[PDB]
Design a binder for this molecule. Structure first.
Ligand SMILES: *[C@@H]1O[C@H](CO)[C@@H](O[C@@H]2O[C@H](CO)[C@@H](O)[C@H](O)[C@H]2NC(C)=O)[C@H](O)[C@H]1NC(C)=O
Ligand SMILES: *[C@@H]1O[C@H](CO)[C@@H](O[C@@H]2O[C@H](CO)[C@@H](O)[C@H](O)[C@H]2NC(C)=O)[C@H](O)[C@H]1NC(C)=O
Ligand SMILES: *[C@@H]1O[C@H](CO)[C@@H](O)[C@H](O)[C@H]1NC(C)=O
Ligand SMILES: *[C@@H]1O[C@H](CO)[C@@H](O)[C@H](O)[C@H]1NC(C)=O
Lengths: 48, 48
């Protein structure tokens, strides 16, 4: 049900954030891309 | 005219930000250092 990002050689699930991932292109080009939510750690810091 | 940062093996220009670069030293030591503007993605989030 949930999506995580792990190191390749050892299972260690982390919450998918903007500090784990980078942005390039859009979803109309990558084959097999999946919808999910990426957590932004700066948003609740701004809100609080 | 403009300055970008790209991976060395494939031309893919990106906006020079504090997440693409690291700070060390000052302008008076590096030979050939060039003036430019480094974008900070946190400033417009703080301002908005
Ligand atoms: C991922 O979400 C996007 C929208 O956030 C979905 O794209 C939509 O597709 C439906 C049906 O084709 C359209 O009614 C919407 O107008 C589309 N929105 C956009 C922004 O394109 C996409 O289908 C979702 N991906 C999957 C496979 O679930
Ligand atoms: C980069 O911009 C700085 C200004 O922020 C320039 O530094 C000035 O240049 C001359 C002296 O070299 C005078 O305007 C000031 O005394 C300098 N300021 C400081 C604090 O160094 C610098 O010359 C510019 N570099 C280039 C090549 O344009
Ligand atoms: C994987 O292959 C199946 C066919 O067995 C297809 O239905 C599915 O869309 C494919 N998914 C991706 C990400 O290529
Ligand atoms: C590069 O070479 C030119 C001569 O063609 C010289 O004017 C310039 O100062 C040099 N710059 C550096 C950083 O060595």
């Amino acid at each position: 049900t949930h999506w995580f990002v792990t190191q390749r050689n050892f299972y260690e699930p982390q919450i998918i954030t903007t500090d784990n991932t980078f942005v390039s292109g859009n979803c109309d080009v990558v084959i097999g891309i999946v919808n999910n939510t990426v957590y932004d750690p700066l948003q609740p810091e701004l809100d609080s």
